[PDB]
Amino acid sequence: TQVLVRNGIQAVGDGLTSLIIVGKKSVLKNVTFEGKFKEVAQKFVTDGDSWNSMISRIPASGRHPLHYELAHLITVPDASSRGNTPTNAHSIYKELKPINYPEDTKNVHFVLFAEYPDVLSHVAAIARTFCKFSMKTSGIRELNVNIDVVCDKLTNEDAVFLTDLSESVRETARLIDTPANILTTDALVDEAVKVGNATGSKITVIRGEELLKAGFGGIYHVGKAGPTPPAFVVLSHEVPGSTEHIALVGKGVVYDTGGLQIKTKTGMPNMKRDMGGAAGMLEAYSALVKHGFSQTLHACLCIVENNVSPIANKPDDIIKMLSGKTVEINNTDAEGRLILADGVFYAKETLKATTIFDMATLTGAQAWLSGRLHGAAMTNDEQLENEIIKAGKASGDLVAPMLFAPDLFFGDLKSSIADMKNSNLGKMDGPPSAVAGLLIGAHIGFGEGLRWLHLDIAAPAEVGDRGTGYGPALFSTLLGKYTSVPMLK
Amino acid sequence: TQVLVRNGIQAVGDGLTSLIIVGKKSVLKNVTFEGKFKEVAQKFVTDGDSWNSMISRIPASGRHPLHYELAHLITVPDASSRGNTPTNAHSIYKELKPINYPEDTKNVHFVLFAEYPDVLSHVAAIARTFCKFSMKTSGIRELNVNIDVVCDKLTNEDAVFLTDLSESVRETARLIDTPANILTTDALVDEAVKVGNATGSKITVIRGEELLKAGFGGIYHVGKAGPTPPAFVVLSHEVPGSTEHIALVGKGVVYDTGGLQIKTKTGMPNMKRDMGGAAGMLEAYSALVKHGFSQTLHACLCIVENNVSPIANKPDDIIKMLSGKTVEINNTDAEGRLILADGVFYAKETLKATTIFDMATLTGAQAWLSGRLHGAAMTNDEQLENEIIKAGKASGDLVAPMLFAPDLFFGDLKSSIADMKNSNLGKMDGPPSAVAGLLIGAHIGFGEGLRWLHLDIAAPAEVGDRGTGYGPALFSTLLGKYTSVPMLK
Amino acid sequence: TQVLVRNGIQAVGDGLTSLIIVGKKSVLKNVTFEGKFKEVAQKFVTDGDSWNSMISRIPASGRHPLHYELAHLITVPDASSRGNTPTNAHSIYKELKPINYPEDTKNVHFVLFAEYPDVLSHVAAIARTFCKFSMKTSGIRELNVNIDVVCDKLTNEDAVFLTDLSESVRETARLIDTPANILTTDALVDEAVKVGNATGSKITVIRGEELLKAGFGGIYHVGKAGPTPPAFVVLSHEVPGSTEHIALVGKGVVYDTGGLQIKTKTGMPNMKRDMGGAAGMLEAYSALVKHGFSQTLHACLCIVENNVSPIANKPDDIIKMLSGKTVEINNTDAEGRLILADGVFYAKETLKATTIFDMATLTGAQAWLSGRLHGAAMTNDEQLENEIIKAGKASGDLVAPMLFAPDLFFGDLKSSIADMKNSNLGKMDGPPSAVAGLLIGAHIGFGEGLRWLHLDIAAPAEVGDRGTGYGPALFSTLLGKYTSVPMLK
Amino acid sequence: TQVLVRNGIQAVGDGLTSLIIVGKKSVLKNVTFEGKFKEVAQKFVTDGDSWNSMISRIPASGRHPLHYELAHLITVPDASSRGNTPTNAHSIYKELKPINYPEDTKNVHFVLFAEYPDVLSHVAAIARTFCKFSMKTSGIRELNVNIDVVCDKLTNEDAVFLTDLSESVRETARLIDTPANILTTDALVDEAVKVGNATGSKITVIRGEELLKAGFGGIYHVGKAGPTPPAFVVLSHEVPGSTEHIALVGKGVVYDTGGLQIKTKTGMPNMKRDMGGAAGMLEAYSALVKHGFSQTLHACLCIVENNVSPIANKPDDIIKMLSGKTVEINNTDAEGRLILADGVFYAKETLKATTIFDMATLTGAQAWLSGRLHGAAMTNDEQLENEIIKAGKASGDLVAPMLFAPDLFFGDLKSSIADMKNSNLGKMDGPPSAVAGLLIGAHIGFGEGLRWLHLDIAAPAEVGDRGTGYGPALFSTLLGKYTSVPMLK
Ligand code: NA
Ligand code: NA
Ligand code: NA
Ligand code: NA
Ligand SMILES: [Zn+2]
Ligand SMILES: [Zn+2]
Ligand SMILES: [Zn+2]
Ligand SMILES: [Zn+2]
Ligand SMILES: [Zn+2]
Ligand SMILES: [Zn+2]
Ligand SMILES: [Zn+2]
Ligand SMILES: [Zn+2]
């Protein structure tokens, strides 16, 4: 299925077409049934009066069928709470995700009535519902999707970016939804390398025993009992003289069995999704680099499978991390933070990055801190904290803050015999999601001298049985000021 | 220990002899203490009056010693409920299984007073108590067992069949009781091939990577993490021009650790017994083919070990089955149904079987449906359902019906990304044992156009620490009309 | 909200009307867009061609909107499995239950195109979706519902019965949905007495200490720690000279905390629904007696609350039942079977009933035997077993059989010091749901000399957060031959 | 034991004296061993050189003995993270709480070298270590404690306030530490009434059946199964013409067994502490009103015991709250939010409060959001959120923000039959601690038109086996601008 975003209502192809109209109630109230909109809608809506009559009756928000199978109106609420995004983009996903198109549909046509500040989140929300991945052996249909944005200020360059963002969103979700017997560490390295090639990146791949020899103890020791070997992949977009040097470090655990401290019968399904951080960072990097990204930018992907054999990590094991510090592993399922400790140290030490983001499906505890729609951000930099929350609101990839207090909470990871433990299996003073992030930061002085932000996306990376494609929209809005894209600037 | 069934009371060898007399109360009441019976019993019972006095006193059923160590009378109840077998054959097993014979016993002599409809189940029940398998390093004794049936209608050919049935029962139980460090997949293939040779079968063995290449995704992917490789074994008894074409498909999981969704500390012991279906089908095939079986008959054994390594099945994995359909594995311990989906498809597609039975120690849930004495049968064919229940009653291998409703229950296995999941780990609309069977049937249109019967024997395949040898008696009575055996015809 | 069933399409009141059309695909294919149907549907469907075009496109089954908010077509599948009802009535409930009507809807008009054998189950399925009970403090709307049945053979008397059946269904569900702080034992006694008065019944109420004095040890000892006292209520419809004498005994546990063997935090919610058996028997009795029921009929309601105090049942307690037999209570949460043992003994001994039905939300184990749509029936009478399965199919209140084997399974309830225990907390030979029923039957010789049927409806009595109103439709079809209703005769 | 705070080092009584010196490293480095300090310290520290030598050697923070039993120096760190308080007051508690004084100690003398912004938190931290409550039958000693603050800017009025704050802190902790067989609902009403009398408050007590009659369904129904009756206590400090009208609503669950959804064997100990919110609000009110509080102020205490009997709340029960809204109780252990829903509605409706704080030991989930040192604040007012975080830093009673999103999260409490449920026992979209607060706010439109702040203090209210006395310091700093106290103004 192909998704194209266009600036203004235009005709779609020949072939059976499903029509979905999307807007906030206040915007829809002001839409005139005339012109190109009338041309598109009058198959399903009789005339202007019937249009106006319907808009009068329908509530503050919801989904209303305009035909027995081919057409829908989605009303987005106007009101929002301060913890929400004022775009209410999640409401589009909620109403749209259930919709199925008749078997012989060729085209899906969206007419999106969105004000300029809403366009990006609304487009992304629609894109997320076009799930690339299926292994069904019948019934597979490819559709031609046009998202036609009705918004004065939108440029043609904006529409290119939104098409690329839609792709980055759907790619992130595809990578997440693919089972790990197919998306192995090798396959995810190959996926990253494809983006590396497309973006003209400098590509570094350190794999298997090369990781051990190079001192990547976290990445190596976590992944050594996988069926295919661990890897660290760097895509670098180097801009001579750039003022910023930004790293996007992603957790790429292609499957997490928990390791020898194994997950339960009901805990282990869904664990193909434990690489959602790496997928989201990779696809964010792709969207940004496609649009004239003016600063130096690196994607650093820590790609392992956490599995069970006599050579696997065992609780009590002490390993030496890339940083040179020792970690006592008391929880083999707290493996993401080990691999990210190496990725973030590499970004600081080797890449000389001065802004380091890491994003990970890190903890089940994250949902108890920020719920299922907000990623949980922990940073040494207060201004960056405010800025990423603002970016979450503008993108629809919501972000809530975690407490940053290494002085109060790092003692939760005290070890008698190593520099630290990787987890605490009892009562601790910190929120567990914060403590998990502090294990990562402990290998770069908790961000001292630079800006470091850890983002835990375990719950917002998925809804139901599907990846959401979280990450590309967030980082496009956060770092989009360094692109050529008018709506990001 | 050797077991011979004879038509009428006869002398036994020289050597210390244990005597066990068995009968329903009403039959025993009519036995005259004279003739050959008196000859055998008067070591232990004084005369006719003392015999009659005892029969008067003893209750409606039980076991009564006739000597301090050498002799017993077992009284079988006459009454039975409609859900039971009117043979009450389980009562013989209950009373007999505890009996031990003195160390220096050479012979065990049974005098079985049974009416013609009871003989087969009663003989089988006695046979089950002679457990072949032991690895004790002292105390091992081999006995000469004669089961002398006192029944007017019995023929000498019947006695040959009953001896063969006794062997098939004891062989099934031996295979079940043998620990899996000895009965590996390789060893069970060898056992099936021995029966293949003895029966003059056409033998097909597809093993290891040959399964993968041939498209047996269920059998291969389940067994790939075993210490010895997966196999599919077919023994074919082809009868040109036969009207029926019958397949006996058996679950041969030589050990089930549960896989990466591992069984618990108390759940995993006994899991050598997870090949009881394959053993019972193999030994049923053997008993039938020994007696002039007039229709085309196949034994199809799916032989795997379900174990734990980095290459094992993981929940989320999607595989392609022999049928070409995809299955999302969300439960690595729901492995029997995966391997049987291939076996049943093979029987339909390759063997052209038009009656397909599969029998398996499939689910713990089975005991909550049919209890511990009845196998649970699910079939698309109502007449076959009645016929197998009738066969259960006549054989003593009891069978109770499951609901057959793919329309109501198959939705329990819905998958977003594959054709189906293999299990449901939450609330479901179907009985879990039925849903387990429907996963198998989903790969042959739930039996459309043919007769398909799935039989879950998890609990009735064992009592205490011992296999019961369930299966040969059931299928001998069910399919015995196609043999030369008078009592089956 | 009022529900009226009419014989043929007729006009509805003034006021905003929602229209729902219901039929099997094959029936809908043959409907002509003319006459009264056209009059009703042409608000929403343009003309005959558009009607025919739509019917061509829509799949084998589902729900299709005919308007943005006011109208729906529900297509019922034609095909069904042998374990299902050929009415497919559950499909109506599945598609209809989600539908919401706009706030200002006055009328809901159903046009039901059903063949004669489908009408009763289809009407009941629609009725179940009109939930009487709500304590919402805004948004409450009462609707005028007309179910217009288009069926040649239907009589006006049939339509009266179907209206009464709809009421009995909705009343059963109302009683179930009402929280137990409102529907106390006292309140449920009052509800039964209201039906007693309306039906001109002879009414007996034995309450509190009168139960103890009268020897109702099961009912008394279970309910003695409730906040309001235990009761046994009998409504009798005595027909001099009748050939049959039928008792409907219902489990009326208004709330089940489990007792001192208390339910878990997640196990205890929903336990207001533990009186669903009593509600269903009461409302079945009501529907039958309204229609000239020609045999002697009794409703016997065992009404208790199972709660926690120093005077409550404790495991180890031994009580004397109405039967005079002693029961060792080893499970205070196996309380339904204790109260029903008294109700069934009373029906036999005092009422002289020769057909005794008991219906109960008895066991969580029931779903593992018969799933969530089928009640599980255990009876001493094979013909009655077949007849109730047939009644389940005709009514849509599905029934599946349990094994009846007191000889094999009653030993699961062996006690060293009382006549029996009420449960087995370990491994047992019977299906647990069957063993639960056998505790009841043990107090009437397992039905010896009469017909006894126990029906466990724990799961089919509810879907989601709502009672289904199971029971009235089943018993109307089972016992409707004794009424004046043409469609039941 | 009596605690007096003084402005400057002064002599203490006759009698054996323990000396504890407290300061940040940077402050201690600048202290001259002369004058009054030398007079006090030279018992334990030889002279200036030995003083300076020691200060040079000791690390950045810790505790160092100055005598074998009588004396200690506590060094407080200078550095702090942004999530911490820059006072580092918790470090004082950590080092001091372990200290024991010899049996015959009469006096404890603190010399506190603190800069003006640190004084309040440091004093409070010392006060918390003087635990009032003990029922030991030997070894009980009362001490005379003088905390001598060495700080230029401190006034004599400040020292009065700090003495009162010390008392409020120790009183809160005493109430918390007292077992509930002593601190019953009656006893806690009496405690509140004592403060009511001392402060010249208008006192309202609504108790037992008066709560039911007055419509306090939350307070009444939660507490009705306690051994002593539920109560609602209001202390009002009414200031004619005041611009603000502030309510402090506290959760006073004197013991929480969990109710019929009972707590576990290891979950139930410590549940005397479930009234920590009410204690902290009461003692905050006391400290503020003692110091010329210029605005209208109310303490509203919801005082219940949540226990187990046949009349207790049961999950499924639906009650009507003071607000008139209905709540379906699906979790009897989610009882604090029910009682607070009434308290907050009362504060809005009856008291006309326009700033409403509620504070509660509400959820175990709170520690997963904000950890064990920070209360978790959820408010409709962003400025108030910032202001209370600032107050947490200045007081040492730390506060972290929760997400405020009723639009996103209130759907977690959806009910089919009541206006809402009180909890969600499965997966929810919100942080569970936020959802718990939203149940409270749902009864006042989530704060619409006013300022509402909910503060969950479950973990920060205690360390080890002792109440911390959290709350008085926080509200003194938050609302101290309305007092006459120079250091608060
Ligand atoms: Na298809
Ligand atoms: Na020996
Ligand atoms: Na309303
Ligand atoms: Na002492
Ligand atoms: Zn993990
Ligand atoms: Zn992980
Ligand atoms: Zn298994
Ligand atoms: Zn298995
Ligand atoms: Zn119960
Ligand atoms: Zn019950
Ligand atoms: Zn509680
Ligand atoms: Zn509480």
Side-chain angles (χ1 to χ4, degrees), chain C residues 123-325:
Chain C
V123 169
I126 295 166
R128 309 175 198 289
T129 68
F130 289 94
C131 306
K132 289 191 174 196
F133 190 81
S134 178
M135 283 173 75
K136 278 179 185 291
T137 59
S138 68
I140 293 296
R141 298 292 180 266
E142 311 306 336
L143 300 173
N144 163 56
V145 179
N146 286 285
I147 310 171
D148 290 357
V149 180
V150 181
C151 175
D152 288 325
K153 284 181 183 183
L154 203 76
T155 73
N156 289 354
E157 178 171 20
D158 292 331
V160 182
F161 165 73
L162 291 166
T163 301
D164 284 337
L165 176 64
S166 296
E167 172 71 352
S168 276
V169 169
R170 295 175 71 223
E171 284 291 276
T172 300
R174 174 181 65 78
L175 294 171
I176 288 166
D177 293 342
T178 304
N181 62 324
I182 298 178
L183 193 79
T184 59
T185 61
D186 288 348
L188 183 54
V189 169
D190 289 347
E191 296 271 7
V193 172
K194 282 183 79 182
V195 169
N197 270 275
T199 55
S201 296
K202 176 180 177 191
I203 303 165
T204 308
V205 175
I206 306 172
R207 190 160 169 268
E209 300 298 303
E210 308 153 14
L211 290 166
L212 179 59
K213 300 189 183 73
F216 290 83
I219 307 190
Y220 180 80
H221 292 291
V222 168
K224 61 186 165 174
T228 55
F232 182 64
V233 174
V234 183
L235 312 181
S236 295
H237 175 78
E238 299 183 308
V239 179
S242 64
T243 61
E244 308 301 338
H245 290 83
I246 300 161
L248 305 171
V249 188
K251 175 182 174 179
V253 176
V254 299
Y255 197 85
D256 193 3
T257 65
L260 278 164
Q261 287 159 291
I262 198 164
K263 294 182 180 288
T264 63
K265 181 165 223 191
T266 56
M268 199 185 293
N270 306 337
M271 291 302 101
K272 77 191 168 166
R273 301 187 196 131
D274 208 29
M275 40 52 70
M281 290 314 223
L282 176 61
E283 302 295 333
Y285 176 90
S286 176
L288 289 166
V289 172
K290 287 172 173 291
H291 293 274
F293 195 81
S294 69
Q295 307 297 313
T296 290
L297 184 64
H298 311 271
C300 303
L301 307 182
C302 305
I303 297 167
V304 298
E305 179 167 330
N306 194 28
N307 215 306
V308 174
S309 82
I311 67 159
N313 285 338
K314 300 179 260 266
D316 291 352
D317 280 0
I318 297 172
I319 63 168
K320 183 168 275 190
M321 306 303 288
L322 187 61
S323 68
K325 288 173 180 303

Side-chain angles (χ1 to χ4, degrees), chain A residues 16 19 89 92 252 274 303 366 407 410 421:
Chain A
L16 191 60
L19 171 68
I92 296 170
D274 208 29
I303 297 167
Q366 168 277 309
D407 54 358
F410 180 65
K421 294 192 178 178

Side-chain angles (χ1 to χ4, degrees), chain C residues 340-405:
Chain C
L340 293 163
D342 285 354
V344 167
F345 185 81
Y346 187 92
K348 180 182 182 182
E349 168 72 21
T350 298
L351 303 179
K352 316 300 186 185
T354 55
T355 306
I356 303 169
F357 296 98
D358 77 80
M359 185 170 71
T361 53
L362 200 65
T363 64
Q366 168 277 309
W368 297 57
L369 191 155
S370 65
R372 299 192 175 287
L373 277 63
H374 290 67
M378 191 187 77
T379 178
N380 70 325
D381 193 273
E382 190 179 353
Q383 284 173 81
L384 183 54
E385 185 184 284
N386 295 327
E387 192 183 354
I388 203 168
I389 287 158
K390 172 176 165 174
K393 286 190 200 294
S395 58
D397 281 359
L398 293 172
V399 178
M402 288 211 263
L403 285 169
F404 182 81

Side-chain angles (χ1 to χ4, degrees), chain D residues 251 253 256 274 333 335-336 361-362:
Chain D
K251 175 182 174 179
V253 176
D256 193 4
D274 208 29
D333 198 4
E335 89 292 331
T361 53
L362 200 65

